Amino acid sequence: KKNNYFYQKEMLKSNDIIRSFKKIRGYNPLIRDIINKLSRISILRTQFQQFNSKMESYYLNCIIEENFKEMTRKLQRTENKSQNQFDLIRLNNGTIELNGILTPKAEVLTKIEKTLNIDELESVHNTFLTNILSHKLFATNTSEISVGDYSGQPYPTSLVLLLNSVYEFVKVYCNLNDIGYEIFIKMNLNDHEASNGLLGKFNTNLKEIVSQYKNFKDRLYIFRADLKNDGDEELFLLSKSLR
Amino acid sequence: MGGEIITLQAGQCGNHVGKFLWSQLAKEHAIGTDGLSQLPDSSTERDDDTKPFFRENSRNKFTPRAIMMDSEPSVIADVENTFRGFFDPRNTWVASDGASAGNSWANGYDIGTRNQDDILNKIDKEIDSTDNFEGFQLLHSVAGGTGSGLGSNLLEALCDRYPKKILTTYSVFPARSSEVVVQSYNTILALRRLIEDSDATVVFDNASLLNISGKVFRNPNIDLQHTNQLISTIISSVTNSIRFPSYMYSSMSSIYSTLIPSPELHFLSPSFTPFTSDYIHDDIAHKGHSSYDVMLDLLDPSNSLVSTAMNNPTYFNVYNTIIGNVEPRQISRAMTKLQQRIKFPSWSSSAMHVNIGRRSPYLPLQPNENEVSGMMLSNMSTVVNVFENACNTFDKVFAKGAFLNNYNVGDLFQSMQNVQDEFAESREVVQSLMEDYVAAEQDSYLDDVLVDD
Amino acid sequence: GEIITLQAGQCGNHVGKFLWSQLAKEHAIGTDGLSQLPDSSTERDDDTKPFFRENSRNKFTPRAIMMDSEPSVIADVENTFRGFFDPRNTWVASDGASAGNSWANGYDIGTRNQDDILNKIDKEIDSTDNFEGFQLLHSVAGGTGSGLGSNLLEALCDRYPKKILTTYSVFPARSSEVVVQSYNTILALRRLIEDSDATVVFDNASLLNISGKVFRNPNIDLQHTNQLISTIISSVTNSIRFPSYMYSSMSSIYSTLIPSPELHFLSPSFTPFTSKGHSSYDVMLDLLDPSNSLVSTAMNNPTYFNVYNTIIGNVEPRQISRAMTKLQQRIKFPSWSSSAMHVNIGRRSPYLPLQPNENEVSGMMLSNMSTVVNVFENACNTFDKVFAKGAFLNNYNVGDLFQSMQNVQDEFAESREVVQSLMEDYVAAEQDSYLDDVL
Amino acid sequence: YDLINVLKHLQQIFLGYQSGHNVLKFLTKNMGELTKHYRNDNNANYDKLLQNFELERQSENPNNLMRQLLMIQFDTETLPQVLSHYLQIYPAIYHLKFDINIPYPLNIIISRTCMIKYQIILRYQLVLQYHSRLLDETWMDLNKTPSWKYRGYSHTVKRRIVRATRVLHAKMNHFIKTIMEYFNQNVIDKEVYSLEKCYRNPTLAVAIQNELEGGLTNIMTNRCLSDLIPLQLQIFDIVYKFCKFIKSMRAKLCQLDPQEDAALELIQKLIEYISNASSIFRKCLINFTQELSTEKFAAGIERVLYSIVPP
Ligand SMILES: Nc1nc2c(ncn2[C@@H]2O[C@H](COP(=O)(O)OP(=O)(O)OP(=O)(O)O)[C@@H](O)[C@H]2O)c(=O)[nH]1
């Protein structure tokens, strides 16, 4: 939420400053390329924020799916039961076992609600929490998880690295927006007669943003290759959508 | 990031669309026509949120945060008589200026600039009546000259009155114009201000509207009321993401962030499956469609509300909102099928976006064939052809200067040369917009910053 | 595996309606398309997927498209089967009623409105994943039907080179319109030789004769002929619609029946049926007898190349072996091809109402022999006679065929040449010297 | 417990009774995976095949307990290898198998020896259906490829190569499909009918199990299968050579379609290759005919003989 709020703040600041340029630009022939570069950096920031929001929405979708499976099948187990009277156990070798005895199909020679009490509810809540924790993308710094190929870092570690990179991107975008506001004030003061140092700072910040975007694209391609080579269909679909 | 949105009804078509939208919202939230909510005020547990659109004066009454502004008092009086107590009589602006003296944009701009004090005072009053604000939603109705002028004046006031608010506009474009020259002049003069100040703009071409109204309805005769009912349903569906707060999209700013890549590209194209809340909605349970078929219909050109003219259309931001019991596996299947069928730019790796909303617990439940509906919004450059028709009319008639005796009165320019220069500047700005669109359609748009840093 | 039915012309529409009614009565689908079976048991042994698409309402829409220049028959079929077919799968070309019984107008309409048919077939293919080919049912006598069939055949062979196309061609009888219908027949036959993959022949004269023999009323109706076409198509597709152990696709059937693409014309037969009493030995004897074939044999001892029979009913192996020995003794095979005789036991549909003459095991048989070459020679001789004796075909043409009549004569000469080469290849395969190049 | 439904499900799974469509769809979906696993070593990852199998099992109706409990696995030995290990006969292909974990109290009736018999029968039927699918695919290619159905330019090689290969494929079909029909009619169908008619008013579950084991023993000891395995081991290699020759001819036809003597030399090499292959296959068929005539088995045998004898 901090990343998303910072992205939205930068977006509204850039939108307001561009609206101010469009209002009091007049003719301004020397600002056309600067506005084009600002729009390009805004598009890059928009792609960054779209990736961040896509990751956040995927995580929230998994969370809400777990919550729905907990409410419909655990909190409301006695209401609209799953009817799966067969209890199976899956092992690491792909073997399936039947848990306990096999009850008959309700056939007794004949010639209320199954609600959960205090301890059962507490245990099912604990199992729901453990199922939430056991996600591969949330299993941070664990020995059971496998690192991504050609990277040597786990998936949560690479996600934390991507978060740090997009936070640095947000910070350098805030710096670029401050430089742009200073250039805007200088243009309000004089008509393209000063602010050469501010223009140089803007150019250097744009180059830094471009280099950071290239590095982030390389890291994202590496993460995509990792998701494709992991084998999970969810990671495959996520990589395909990000690509 | 979620704020309230105030509705601005402008012109006859705009007022009709606003009335239809408010009636649809009342039907959805069980508010009714009398203004007093049909549901008892004791059931405060509401999954929706009428606060961004309905001001709650009393525990049972919810006045819509809307202002109607029109030069014809007859339609306003009819709307107020039909919706007894629903609308606010203080938010109705007529200025007692009589009927519009022609269909010129200059007349609307003049009637806006003259009574700018009253409308701005009403806007300030409506803003003071609330606390959290995000922006306005203007109904331009560019087909009418006076309505387009009033909308342009309202935009030119709001842009420098509230620069911290995001502005969205809805421009209804006709299919075949009677006075093609005057209507093209009005639409171009409105698009000038739309490119200048409007943050987001959604077009509505009447050709596809009439086509859908002839297809899904049984009566061959088409009426303007149920024609605007389609735009009303579209607006209600796109505002559902804020009325019934979802888990991903819950604010207009967050919705427009993934739809507006740059302030220059602020024109979208809508599409919707066969509706279910309209008059003739009985012929929907015989299609037997799923969410995948709904996505296919959304991506089909026959369900778009604007003239597609798809000649390898270049997409920039495609977004969809599905309301009903949606399946994630079916959504994934539809996405996999559409990513191999939708043309995507080689310079942008952004794909289509999917959002799932919630259905109203008080709306009439539909059978399992059409219980799930969908809306699609695509950033397509196909609107440049709709604008190219008008600019070609401008180029073929401007060589003589016809109908110049109508745009000279009212506006601040009474001479012919000033009006000619203004029309030439508007033609130049729409030409630059079309050039920017056709350049963004290419890969060099992103390469402009790659070739030089 | 999914096959799409193509109903071309009014005859195609009639036979498609009859086939879909028969399949609905068999698989308990009814006229409303809804599943007439209870929702308590989902275990089924049939296969409705390649022929019916099941929607969320559990309704089975037939995977068929109707291409005809006469919307009247299509509207009648829709009125008779309201709630069964999909209105989006209907194609009337938006040109009004039919006009002209020549192949030229049909092919021109097909080439003009091919985009709609292409979009329809593309949507029908994309609706599912597993596809194998297409199924057409038409009569070469009808000019518009033959033109539409040739157009769709060209589209299929130049669009999907991997899907197999099977068609059911009803040849005209000995009538008066054959002076102009023979043109369309030989044009469609040239198209079949060029691009088609499999064809099942039908002779209208033999069909009417068998109809009058099996029916009490000698006034045989075209609806009765279409019902018999429905019955023979159901008997030949039972093996695909109820696969148990051996046959689960038409690919293996066409592999074991059609030895080479140059010989891809099959003659069907089916006996006994109405529209225990006969043992399987008697059923196969009647199948061998020419009085039960759906095509005019006109041959004392045809040269059998490949035969394949499907027996529907409870059978025992001793009668099968006896009839197999009798068939090996009677039927003559060439000294260069194999004397293969394939028998497939097809299961009966438990969801189908009991056909009259219960417990009577029946049998269908597809043959590749010298019985189709007789009809081919008769048709080509009639065409040659009418062409070399009367120059009247150059008065009814459309489009490019009407712009110049010389190209029409050249195309007809090429059709005569290709059918002559086909009959020469057939009469050469009849001889032992056909495979002399390798021995 | 619905023992009738249980036996129907096991006949559908292992015996292919009324379930040929499902196994044919599985084979057509996993053509490349199966052949790549058979051509590669044990290091080849079968995770994709396992995912396909598990998604097919999930899409299958949950009411079918046998199909929902069906598990897949890989054996380090081939089908002829396990046949020579289990019987007194002599032998990296067909390393796949399936298994059912019979629970309580059904395990006291369905033992593990009948499970092994079911696995062997299922592997044999899978081999037969895979070879039939390969033949059908070869025929479909030959009949649908324009590079194959195109001729002219004074070929003089059409009736020599394409006609010879089509006759060879027709003979292979009239052999394989004929023996498959004979088996599925005179062994599989008869055993299914007996297993369906035995439980009519049953008296002893142990007697039903003994009848089932006796039927399986008859299926395994039928002299047609024991005589075919030493010949099928070569027929399969002949089919492999035939399809690889078909692939090479398809790859060469597009280049041969129109100038040098090298092309004529390659055509001569191809025709002599395929003629030697056809002669070797004819000699092998004559040897198999001699073997089956020496074997003391006869309606289906006479049918197979009439199908395999050349004109
Ligand atoms: N489709 C549609 N168009 C409308 C509707 N109402 C007005 N219009 C448009 O309005 C045009 C006719 O002019 P008017 O309706 O008088 O609009 P105006 O001239 O600006 O007058 P006012 O709207 O009262 O200010 C037509 O070309 C329509 O495009 C409506 O209900 N539906």
Ligand SMILES: Nc1nc2c(ncn2[C@@H]2O[C@H](COP(=O)(O)OP(=O)(O)OP(=O)(O)O)[C@@H](O)[C@H]2O)c(=O)[nH]1
């Ligand atoms: N057996 C049978 N043949 C039919 C039927 N309907 C049409 N035909 C065929 O149609 C031929 C006569 O020509 P038409 O019926 O006018 O068919 P067409 O020339 O294609 O004209 P349209 O069907 O209107 O396009 C006959 O020789 C039949 O082969 C039918 O219901 N049963």
